[PDB]
Amino acid sequence: NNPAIKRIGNHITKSPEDKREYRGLELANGIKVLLISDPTTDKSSAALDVHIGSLSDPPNIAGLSHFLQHMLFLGTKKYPKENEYSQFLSEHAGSSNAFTSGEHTNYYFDVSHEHLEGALDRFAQFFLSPLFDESAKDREVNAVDSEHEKNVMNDAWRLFQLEKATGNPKHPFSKFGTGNKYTLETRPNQEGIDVRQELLKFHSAYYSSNLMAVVVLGRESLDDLTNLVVKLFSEVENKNVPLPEFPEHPFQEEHLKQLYKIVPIKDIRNLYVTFPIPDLQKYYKSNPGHYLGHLIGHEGPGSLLSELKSKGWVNTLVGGQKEGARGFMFFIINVDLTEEGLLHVEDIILHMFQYIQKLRAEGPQEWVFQELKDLNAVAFRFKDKERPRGYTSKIAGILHYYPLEEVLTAEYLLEEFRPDLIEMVLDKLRPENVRVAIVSKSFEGKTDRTEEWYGTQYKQEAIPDEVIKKWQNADLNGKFKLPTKNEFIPTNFEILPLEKEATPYPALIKDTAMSKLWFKQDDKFFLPKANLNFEFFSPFAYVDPLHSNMAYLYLELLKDSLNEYAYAAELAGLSYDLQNTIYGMYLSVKGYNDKQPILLKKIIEKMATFEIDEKRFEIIKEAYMRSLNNFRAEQPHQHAMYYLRLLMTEVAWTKDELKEALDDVTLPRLKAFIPQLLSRLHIEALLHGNITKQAALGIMQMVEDTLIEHAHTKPLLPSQLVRYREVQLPDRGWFVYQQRNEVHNNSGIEIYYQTDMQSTSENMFLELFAQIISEPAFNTLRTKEQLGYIVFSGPRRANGIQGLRFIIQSEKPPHYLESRVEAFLITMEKSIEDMTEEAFQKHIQALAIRRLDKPKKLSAESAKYWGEIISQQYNFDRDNTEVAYLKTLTKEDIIKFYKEMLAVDAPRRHKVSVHVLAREMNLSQAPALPQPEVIQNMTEFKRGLPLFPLVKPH
Template sequence: MSNSAIKRIAKEIIKSPEDKREYRGLELENGIKAILICDPTTDKSSAALDVHIGSLSDPPNIAGLSHFCEHMLFLGTKKYPKENEYSQFLSEHAGSSNAFTSGEHTNYYFDVSHEHLEGALDRFAQFFLCPLFDESCKEREVNAVDSEHEKNLMNDAWRLFQLEKATGNPNHPFSKFGTGNKFTLETRPTKEGIDVRQELLKFHSTYYSSNLMAICVLGRESLDELTSLVVKLFSEVENKNVPLPEFPEHPFQEEHLQQLYKVVPIKDIRNLYVTFPIPDLQKYYKSNPGHYLGHLIGHEGPGSLLSELKAKGWVNTLVGGQKEGARGFMFFIINVDLTEEGLLHVEDIILHMFQYIQKLRMEGPQEWVFQECKDLNAVAFRFKDKERPRGYTSKLGGILHYYPIEEVLAAEYLLEEFRPDLIEMVLDKLRPENVRVAIVSKSFEGKTDRTEEWYGTQYKQEAISDEKWQNADLNGKFKLPMKNEFIPTNFEILPLEKDAPQYPALIKDTAMSKLWFKQDDKFFLPKACLNFEFFSPFAYVDPLHCNMAYLYLELLKDSLNEYAYAAELAGLNYDLQNTIYGMYLSVKGYNDKQHILLKKIIEKMTTFEIDEKRFEIIKEAYMRSLNNFRAEQPHQHAMYYLRLLMTEVAWTKDELKEALDDVTLLRLKAFISQLLSRLHIEALLHGNITKQAALGIMQMVEDTLIEHAHTKPLLPSQLVRYREVQLPDRGWFVYQQRNEVHNNCGIEIYYQTDMQSTSENMFLELFCQIISEPCFNTLRTKEQLGYIVFSGPRRANGIQGLRFIIQSEKQPHYLESRVEAFLKTMEKCIEDMSEEAFQKHIQALAIRRLDKPKKLSAECAKYWGEIISQQYNFDRESDVGSRYSHQNRHRSAHQQPDVGTMPWLSQWQGPAQWLFWTPWAYHQSQGTLSKGFWSVASEPRLPTASASRPVPRGAEGIQSTALSPAQTPTLTVEQVVTDLEQQVEQEVPIYQQAQDDLVPHLHPHPLPQT
């Protein structure tokens, strides 16, 4: 197509000096805006299209239609009518896809091996040209949306978000129920004589207009080639000249202000939400007054609002800043996590908030504060890490609607104009007469009189008097932050040392420590990652010691907070957590002042004095977090119990809760001395540092521990790793556990295969690659077993296997039977697979394996995984990838894959060894869903009677399949000792998509900027 389809080309895109990619902006004649990215080094190409229409534009009588439309677009187009054509093409070429719907946006995105961008983009473009919205898919996908809503039903973040919307102006689009469910998309429309398919066609025809679309495409192709692709595929999208929806009236008018809401949560949490309506600040992005105020109100250093509230024992955390609404309105929020004492002093806490706001008014806007924010943002923009293609295109596609094309990369970073008038304008909105307050606590159970329609949230609404907080005077304890001493000034990239090794090298090996070192030779940014594992046999010896290790580190982080917050603002972060082997510490960011923060942490680790008040507060918060596990998703329970049952040593939540009563301040102090008395340190220092500097850092750590804690080395016999339970042949085990919160079931079926090795890993991953798309298409899309359907490897303690995870309203035995039937089908599919199809899977897997880390921290995490697993195969991806490629080149003589030659698949020909568990959610006597949980595990670990039997008929001939757990972002309170999500991340292989990558999803309200 000629360039007549292009209205404007933007060549001068503002980018970071360190960004080696080439950019071009386009505006097509039909109104589509595009940003094109040429990256000759990328392994994956990607594209995203954002439609500037979301749930706020749903018809009033069909809630969730925009979200439903998002789901349906994946299920066939006129050019590619096959229901799973798009997902199958991506799966065969190392790709993945997803989408999300928010109030104003519907965002679609994918990635694929760089050679197949055009094929993927062609299939993708049809979503916006000629979708089928096939009637046969409609009912099934309504069930998928309903299952998605059911998953969110007991999630406090979703419940509170909908309650916020429901308590504003009921006639404002903000009040709508955005997710939708079976009632809004099927039951009610049917009763009212509404044809939902026709409404879908109408919605797509009306709103999916090119003038409301923005595209981002990233590939190896030149900018001219990318331009031709976009013009060829998207210039025919029709421009219906749809006016951009705007919402100039705020959903919170005078009658919705000065209101107090007492809300009952699902989990035992105590939160205070203070909200002010403010105008849309988007057009002021060059000065960003909301960012300025969020920086000060949300500050955590000495003299801050948080510092004073913590000193009084009222709060644990505080978040302050602007929160997006929609085009026309925003919110400014101050949210705190309350202590038990804080719940009794809510009015005093809010008074302190207004006192701090009054302090800001009296001081007036400070140009030096703005300049510091400007400098920090400029450094972050200059040295920002390279993004993964799919996330990058999705983000840029969305923000193209808000900024000039030339500024789209820089607009959210670079501040240019100090505008005290705008700061004062926003400050003027933060007054008692404009406030809305929500208190969230279990203490309100039985004291409410209202119920939110869609989630059933119980709450009580009360008016706030006109006089409340009007006389907030100045508080002498509040001070503006000090100038940040952690802002880096030295950005020198150190020259590579002579004969620098390609992979981490062991440069120190003593009784006290092992030090691995790798100088960065890929990213060339002034950053480093410092990782330390402190091994101690006392950290996990029993539930009591596990609890004390957790509390010790939580109290340590709490005491470091005011000091480390300045470092965090300056791009220098640390993480400190207990593990089953001891303690893990990482310090990441700019290397200029990294050693200063590290030294402070190690010194504090050995010398800090525990504050008795904070001890009681953090202990109580920890107990609540253990209790709150009951409200996690059923599939998360599945992963948790499987780990307990398969790991040699693991403590349950109940065991931890029982032992927590025995933790006293005196006992904790004695434990800390014991914990630090004998250690072994294994470390990886990786980045813009020299070998000599790395040795110096390790020596500093050792010297500090020896000086203050008199630390001695562990004995070699104490450096042992836990083992995995071996499942016997023909073993089948069930573990039953109730789920008291959710109506959904969760099932995990685990087939244990063998110890990890390069060859075994390859076969397992190849099988996962082959079944991944058919599993999702069969069990999720066609059979509608549930919103969460996942398959992939499970790896732990050197042992691996395959697993399936499903969360569903259906009976667990039925889910089991469908998985077995699917495996039987896959056995036949693999036997009949053509050589061409087999080669596609090998190529896709090789591409995934050879996909290089995009930033230093990702590469470091890969190396660190090899170190903590004690496998030390730093070249694993290249080794496995080349083996796949080698196998691909040498299989051409065969007409079809010889399944019998695959050790694990051949082993499946006979009886399988497997583990199966699920929440039992069907009440036989009543025939209705009730709350329960049923699971399966290995006999040596069973706390109750187990059963063993031959493999069910449905699994004959196939001995293994399994799933990787899902990683769904949730808003939760304190993390428990064993952080489930982090463990999942370690288990999921680099090529495997997480749940978020497999299913469309609806985003909750964005978090505030701080």
């Protein structure tokens, strides 16, 4: 017996392929705990989920629970140092993060498997004795405000909060979750509120053990993990807090049959149909919402989308249940709109109700349920292994909704067929309780009201009862047939035995002028899955802005045509990715091996015999036109990254050049581009997973024959197979490029300190220095000086050349952010000198563990191999190679590396800065900086500078 534990077990149901060991328990204080034992893991992890969220925010202090989340990382009474938590994890190959939903506050971290207890101890203190230091309070409020600021011009966020502000006004659903400097600092002070206590009271009142769930993953035995949690979580006291419920729906009858005309930031056209439904979480074993979601949201033949897309009204559709909170959910049907789909919205919604009455007319189909059941059964059995950090984080959240034994299976497996639940949910999808929202730029100027927090321009109409009556009286449309039998459902899961000549790293098994085939039979995971990666090289893909446009259009027209066919496969765990690269095309087929060659053959064969529908060419072109112009509205820090990539690469077409060339892309000229693109190619491929060398050679060869036959493809010449170089910066030089963001009101900046080529030596000097400055960069530029919410530091790798980059999104001007960063680098230098030689070799093993963390799923391993192939470096034993060299490094080696390359005095300093201005434009101080040559023309700048060589392979 153990008094600190209320109950144990029984046995946590897991996949047969899962060799981790589990144990569920409920502590005496009511904390539901899952213990994961995995002796093979390189990183240990833990997570806690409090069942209190932003819905429990005080009406007078919006975003308090969100703000409280940020403050827990900033010190406890047992660990008073403001960054003890983040510094500990940083020095032990770990990371941490948290989020705040309406009903949940979730904390999680990972760390080196040897220091789980050390990390967990500091972590547990967050719930026990947090400081909420006031000096930390008036600082971190800016990080929250800067966070909201990035979301203020986000159409997704504006709409998200808009739905909240159109329901019951003081239903907790209406509350502003994020909070800003105003709601958190300004207004409380005006109202005489002390924030530190209303933090402490909220933490006292709501952070009860009664509302908590814990998941810990480590190498330790299940019993060793039991003693660990009990030791440090038995102290969380049980206030016995009643779990918040919201029985009454935020959308009452006054909020139904309503129309919302909304003005967006980007140029988009979308129709949002919403149905209020009760909380279906209770019915998870049968899951009626999923059944309808699968049918309504189906994209196969005879489906709703299939016909709205045929009339040229929509292009995409998402439908199904959207969680609201405990007591209420939503059923949604969202489509994007074409230009004339915007003019036939009444008819579009009519077709929706016509499909709904098709479902009602033929009733619940058990065979469908069975298909959804078997698919979830297969998906669970052969489920890819998850990384500890995200795994513990998710389980900790779902420990509140399901019994301990079902937590791994509950979200996946279905058990009961409930036609009644099917039909009653279906009964609440009627026109009389509908909510319609239209998002288009065409409503600009015609709007009357304005959303409070984001400033959303829109207009609210009551849907004319004339219209409701036409929706209620919806005949059966003969063009809506229920999805047929899914024929991509795998039946062959036999893991083929490891061959005698099997290799630990991908072996080159075909080296012709036409193709280069890399292959490795899976030797670690043993699932029925396989990844087929292909890179098609062609000069005609990126020769000019015109062809880069046509290359995009060609592949997006192709995917559009394959959608009905391929959708069935994705449901059956067989997906494909097809996109245009600067070197040609990229195709990747992932999923179960069984029906995998069928899909691939269908892809390539459609690829080489594509017949273009002109009115799908019109629609997609128009969408692509908007997508390029919508780039104007992305965040300043992304713009800063976009410009740098343009500056430092040999050949790169700007998005504004892509628009001018788009108007001349006629249908006959596109249809003539395709045969010429496929005229001569070179295919570098990686076939990895549950397949043999012979199958792989057959797959690759069947791709070639299909091309040699329908497109008459013959090989490309070796000289045409070279990649793009990176601009070589002059020693002791500094360049600055400056642009403005017409949409966002924050400034962005990327600083790039270029080092020389990627070498086994040069790589690790960069990645070690980056490791050391990782935590202090976040600590200084954000936690202390609060420049912005987005503060990034780390290496930059492109075209075989590396360097150090700083990314900051702030309100302060870039020229100021420049100094702060330069001041920080001086700060780091005199910190590398006064760090103990053991504290140095702690950073080394930290980096070492991160590099030597082996993958845990197939696609993760495939990514690492594929990286070496497209990098044209082919260094498959990079980790063991570079990690070994890393340990050789002394503290002085890094010192002179800074002094020579990165320092302000540096003989070889190569600095480029991108300054994206905002819409309208003691501490440590910086050294005096030289006057930078301002780049006023991108191509002119590149024209006047040398180009780096390309890295020699292997």
